[PDB]
């Protein structure tokens, strides 16, 4: 569908009357020669094709003249039309016998040619008129597409000669046919017009200029056909030549002429012997290698010239090839194999991998009567690379092929080169602009963990996201663990850089897969050996950037990797430092405050003194003990110390822990260009509570300072306290026990927002209420307020002031000149006189306000809080044990000295995990890593095996073995029992 | 269904037109979804097929008891 | 209108627009099954709006995860039929 | 009874049919070598 | 000026909108009620 096909396809139309053109006079405005007596306009029959309401998709159909070079069509076909480019044409010669064919030739077209096209997604080229040997195709087409009950339709190309096609003027649009409606059935059967075939799927209408006449398609057929053959397979032009085949299943004198033609061009030609006719005929003349052959095929022909044909014919039998009797309607795609490598005089590994047959390439193997020469099997290599065949890599990589010598800066080129224009790689490589991989890989991990043939290999299938070759890469490589983190770090980079989120859900659970396969693998790993898993686990991955598979995991954010227990067995570990990880909570705080215990048995292990004071859990203990002290310091400052006199000597050191506490967040932010770090610091919520601390210490100090000012810089430190209390949650999420429920706590805040906003819309009606039914007589607007709000809030706590509110409890006097009754409340703020007029009313709503606020409310937040907490329960835990390696290495660097004295520290800094192996060592653990993950692939494998689905599958194959022994069998039976007495 | 799908696989008789609307017609009012289906992947014209006669048609072999007869008594 | 299940759904897999027929399909059997008079009849019914409803709805989540904007666009768009 | 209960389980009773149809593919090659061998080697 | 109409035509700013209404409608109920509803007229 398009509308410049007129500009480029032209149209046939008689010019000089001579009858000889068909047409009548009327029609009309020595020898009918078309190119004498036709002239070329442009066309006005093209688009697609429904028949009459047919329970199909429809048709594409084009009106096209002789002299059209194929390039366009094919161009046409490929791309506007939507044709996959063909991985084989088989075009189809012959039919007789009128509308009957020999039913063993039908079952070769059905069970042959039409299956072996729908597995290669070969394109079967014939006459699109329901007539001669296409209607048998077509039938055949539509049998196989029935019984097949799934698969991919088969392509049909029907090349049919204009002016014989029944019911044609109907396609005649000059703005194209693009909804179409063809009449197929209904009109009576002539041997002039035939209709179209319904099980075609594309139509090419070639117009000479005759009205009605067989044979004017010929030449643009042919010319189609080596045109296809010239083509390239695959991705680019990289792969071996399209190869297309003639099959021959009958005739007369003119196939001789076509199968002639057609070798001319250097096409095989493949003749069904015992079928009779030309046939059978090329096929006896071929076994042979003439009159009484002609006559017994052509009686009263011209019997004269065809011997020259014949020997034309033989002058190229080498594409000849004969389907014999004994041949199945199975082994096809085999003889065609054969013919095309008779043709050759291309490899059968190479056309086994261009139509996606495993099976095809593994036979091929399997024949030692030919050794496979190593630069063949590279070849078959690079093309199923390219074209993405995770299978025949597997088995090419499998046979012996040495992949060392195999890998080139030019073939890895090629390889990179092969990705979609459409793709995330190809904008990254244009940006980076031999690909700059390196520089790729260095903007998208950010040169902190930016990176064997298998290594690179690994690289190239995840960039494509190709999730077969990446997990076989992955299965083939050395540093299987460290590998399998950084292919998720890499897949989840590249993944939010996605347009699509298709794409982006495609990279992602690429990811999940290669997380799960590196956690299944380092378990096992952990399983064997705890040592040389936590060496594994901390070693650096020189094909990583130097990062361990903690800092990957970090990166990658790979919480289910964290959350094993061999790694969080190792966080406890290293987070005792030297010491041993079942030293009891008060054995610590014990040596802690007494330092000589250090040297007794209660902790198991001058460097002594180091290992404790060096640990994390003690540099923790420290840094909660000093910030508990400052905070009794800061206390003892705001309640006694702080008067309007200039500062003491506390409230100075009060000053100099701040500095330090100030100091160290600078530190630690630093520590941990400008703007960026700026922007990552100002992210977290944490350092936001933490900025607000520090700058209301700040302003409080400031107003303090300042004489006028004093009592709101107190207001203001007194609120700082609160600010600096509350962190201390902050520095707990460390702990084992309290950080999974802190980190629950901030899942509640949906349901607190909601309990406050229905009981404030209760609070204001309510207030309002009942101040407009009390009428008080001190009606100030903060009077007014604390009565609307705060009073009936305190109701919720069981601070209800009856005396307040009731007029039966009150004294009732004259308070007021307004006309009514009046009583006077004993409160303070509750207003000097109120009404007594619709008190009842009062009391009535004070029992609703309780019934709706205590009991409903409470309770429906309290359910809301189970319901939150069973939720959120284990998606916190996972949060907490991801999050534990963070902060178990934030405070691994920590100075050993507790803040206050922690200036000395920040002295030593000012104007200034990991495990390393040897190269044996580190072999041996690769080894052994290597081992572990061969053992895990072969019990997953083993594993699939014995499942009950691929034990049914397999008793189905051989259940099909069993019927077509059987078949043979029964023939036997039948040939011996009935032909032989 | 079987017997049907083997008539229509023997190539030796051409099945007409009308032939097929006739199958397609009984089936529409017996209820076969599985013969419609067969017939229509046939290459049957449903364009053609279907005329306000057929239709009506269709819509008399409605039960008695149904409410579709009874709504569409009421509409006359 | 006659309540057959399996000729509706063939009829809806050989159809054009198919999600609002489907929502059409499930909106006419929803207002016919409360003028059932049978309990059986009405259930039936009512299976059947279920499965078209159903069917719709996996139809759109396919043509919404292969494209947003043409899957918005046939959302909002209007149905003659 | 427990080794009756596992004997009647559903993969107990699909290995035991692909054992089976093993054996059914063995006879018949045997069968179909020795009706080519009957069929050509004594006419 | 599309912008304008761009941006209060949608239906969030609508509703944002008929909220703080709202908001004001009550409290100005709230005023005339406990404030300004003397016997007087109005």
Redesign the interface.
């Known amino acids: 569908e398009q509308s410049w096909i007129p500009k480029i396809f032209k149209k046939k139309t008689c010019t000089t009357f001579i009858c000889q053109c068909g047409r009548p006079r009327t029609a009309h405005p020595t020898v009918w020669d078309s190119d004498a007596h036709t002239t070329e306009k442009p066309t006005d029959a093209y688009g697609e094709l429904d ?6 998709k429809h048709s594409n159909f084009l009106r096209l003249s002789d002299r059209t070079d194929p390039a366009a069509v094919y161009s046409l076909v490929t791309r506007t039309w939507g044709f996959r480019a063909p991985n084989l044409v088989v075009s189809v010669l012959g039919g007789s016998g009128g ?3 020999q039913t063993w030739l ?1 079952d070769l077209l059905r069970r042959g040619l039409v299956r072996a096209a729908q597995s290669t997604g070969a394109w079967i080229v014939t006459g699109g008129l329901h007539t001669g040997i296409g209607r048998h195709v077509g ?1 055949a087409v539509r ?1 196989h597409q ?1 019984a097949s009950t799934g698969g991919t339709k088969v392509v049909a190309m029907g090349v049919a000669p204009w002016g014989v096609v029944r019911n044609r003027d109907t396609l005649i649009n000059p703005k194209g046919s693009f909804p179409a ?1 063809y ?4 009109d009576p059967e002539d041997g002039v017009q035939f209709p179209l075939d ?1 099980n075609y799927s594309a139509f090419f209408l070639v117009d000479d200029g005759t009205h009605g006449c067989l044979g004017g398609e010929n030449r643009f057929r042919l010319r189609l056909e080596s045109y296809i053959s010239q083509q390239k397979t695959g991705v680019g032009g990289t792969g071996i030549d399209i190869p297309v085949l003639l099959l021959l299943i009958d005739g007369d004198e003119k196939m001789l002429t076509r199968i002639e033609n057609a070798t001319q061009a250097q096409l095989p030609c493949l003749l069904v012997a015992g079928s009779g006719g030309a046939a059978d005929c090329l096929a006896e003349t071929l076994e042979d290698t003439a009159r009484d052959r002609i006559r017994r095929f052509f009686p009263k022909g011209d019997l004269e010239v065809l011997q020259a044909q014949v020997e034309r014919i033989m002058t190229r039998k080498e594409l000849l090839t004969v389907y014999s009797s004994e041949d199945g309607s199975e082994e096809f795609e085999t003889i065609v194999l054969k013919a095309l490598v008779k043709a050759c005089g291309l490899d059968e590994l190479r056309l086994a991998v261009a139509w996606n047959r495993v099976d095809i390439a593994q036979s091929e193997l399997f024949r030692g009567d030919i050794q496979w020469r190593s630069f063949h099997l590279e070849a078959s290599l690079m093309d199923a690379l390219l074209n993405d065949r995770p299978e025949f890599v597997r088995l090419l990589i499998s046979h012996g092929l040495s992949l060392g010598h195999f890998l080139t800066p030019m073939r890895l080129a090629q390889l990179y080169s092969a990705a979609p224009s459409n793709s995330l790689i190809r904008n990254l490589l244009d940006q980076a602009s031999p690909p700059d991989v390196g520089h790729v890989l260095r903007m998208l991990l950010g040169k902190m963990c930016a990176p064997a043939p298998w290594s690179d290999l690994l690289l190239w299938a995840l960039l494509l996201n190709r999730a077969q070759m990446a997990m076989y890469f992955w299965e083939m490589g050395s540093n299987a663990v460290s590998s399998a983190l950084g292919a998720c770090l890499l897949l989840r980079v590249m993944a939010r850089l996605e347009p699509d ?2 794409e982006a859900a495609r990279r992602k659970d690429l990811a999940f897969k290669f997380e799960g396969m590196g956690v299944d693998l380092f378990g096992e790993c952990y399983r064997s050996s705890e040592v040389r898993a936590a060496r594994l686990l901390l070693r650096r991955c020189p094909l990583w950037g130097d990062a361990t598979c903690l800092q990957l995991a970090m990166q990658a954010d790979a919480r289910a990797f964290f959350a094993q227990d061999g790694v969080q067995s190792l966080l406890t570990q290293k987070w005792w430092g030297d010491m041993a990880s079942t030293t009891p909570i008060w054995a610590l705080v014990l040596a802690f405050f007494c330092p000589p215990l250090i040297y007794t048995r209660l902790i198991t292990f001058l460097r002594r003194w180091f290992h404790f004071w060096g640990a994390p859990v003690t540099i923790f203990m420290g840094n909660v003990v000093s910030y508990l002290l400052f905070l009794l310091l800061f206390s003892r400052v705001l309640l006694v110390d702080f008067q309007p006199a200039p500062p003491g000597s506390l409230e100075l050191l009060l000053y100099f822990w701040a500095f330090t506490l100030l100091c160290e967040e600078l530190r630690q932010g630093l520590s941990g260009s400008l703007s960026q770090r700026l922007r990552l610091y100002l992210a977290d919520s944490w350092n936001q509570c933490d900025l607000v601390a520090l700058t209301c210490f700040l302003l409080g100090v400031g107003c303090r300072l300042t004489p006028g000012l004093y009592h709101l810089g107190r207001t203001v430190l007194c609120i700082d306290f609160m600010v600096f209390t509350v962190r201390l949650l902050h520095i707990f999420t460390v702990n084992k026990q309290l950080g999974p429920k802190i980190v629950i706590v901030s899942k509640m805040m949906k349901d607190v927002f909601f309990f406050l906003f229905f009981l404030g819309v209760w609070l ?1 009606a309510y207030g ?1 209420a009942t ?2 039914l009390l009428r008080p007589r001190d ?1 100030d607007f903060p009077s ?1 307020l604390r009565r609307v709000f705060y009073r009936p809030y305190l109701q919720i706590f069981g601070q209800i002031p009856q005396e307040d509110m009731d007029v039966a409890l009150m004294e009732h006097s004259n308070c007021s000149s307004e006309p009514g009754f009046w009583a006077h409340p004993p409160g303070a703020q509750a207003g000097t006189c109120v009404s007594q007029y619709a008190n009842w009313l009062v009391v009535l709503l004070l029992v609703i306000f309780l019934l709706v606020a205590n009991i409903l409310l409470v309770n429906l937040l309290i359910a809301m809080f189970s319901y939150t907490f069973g939720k959120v329960q284990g998606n916190s835990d996972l949060y907490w044990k991801a999050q534990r390696y963070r902060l178990i290495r934030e405070f691994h660097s920590r100075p050993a000295l507790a803040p206050p004295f922690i200036v000395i520290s920040h002295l030593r800094l000012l104007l200034r995990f990991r495990v390393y192996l040897s190269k044996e060592a580190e072999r041996k653990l690769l080894t052994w890593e290597s081992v572990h993950k061969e053992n895990f692939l072969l019990a997953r494998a083993r594993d699939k095996r014995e499942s ?1 689905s691929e ?2 599958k ?2 189905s194959q ?2 099909d ?2 019927l077509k ?2 078949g ?2 029964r023939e ?2 039948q ?2 029992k009935v032909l ?1 007495r």
């Open positions: 028949f009459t309401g047919a329970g199909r509308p009957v064919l039908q039938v049998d029935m409606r009449r197929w059935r209904g319904y989120a298709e204001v309002v101040e407009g009606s007014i009950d034990r049914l397999r008793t051989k259940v073995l069993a022994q059987l043979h069998i036997y039976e040939r011996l032989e």
